[PDB]
Amino acid sequence: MIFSYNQDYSLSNESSLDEEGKGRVLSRLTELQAELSLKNLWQVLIGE
Amino acid sequence: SMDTFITRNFQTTIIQKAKNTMAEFSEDPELQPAMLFNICVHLEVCYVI
Questions:
Q1: A35 and B48 in contact by Cβ < 8 A?
Q2: Which positions in this protein are listed as binding Mg(2+) 1 (chain B) (predicted)?
Q3: Residue whose C-alpha is closest to residue B10's, from B47, B46, B45, B44
Q4: Fewest beta carbons within 10 Å, which of A9, A25, B13, B41?
């Protein structure tokens, strides 16, 4: 079950995860990434 | 500092288990925030699911 911050994902099985969690996960990821990029904490994560 | 951010955003249990994971992998949580955050998110998503 692969997920990303920019609304991109890859599920091995389709019926394993239905459309509700898929929303909350991407929402949480995007919200977090937003909160990080908002307070300049992304560069430290992207950095080595 | 993300050390504050993670405290604000994530729960206690996540930080505890994440730090326990980083402890078991023999790594300092405070000296490596990125890994702590990655583990925190990676651990949170499971619970979210």
A1: no
A2: 42
A3: B44
A4: B13
* Expt. technique: cryo-EM
Pairing of strands A2-3, A9-10: antiparallel
Q: Which amino acid is at A42?
A: W
Resolution (A): 9.8
Where helices occur in chain A by DSSP H, the ranges are: 21-38, 42-46
B29 annotated ligand-binding residue? no
CA dist list (Å): B32 to A7, B4, B15, B22, B26? 27, 13, 13, 10, 12
CA distances from B35 to A10, A21, A24, A33 (A): 23, 24, 23, 15
State the amino acid at position A34 in one-letter form.
Answer: A
C-alpha distances (whole Å) from B14 to each of A14, A29, B9, B46 are 28, 16, 11, 11
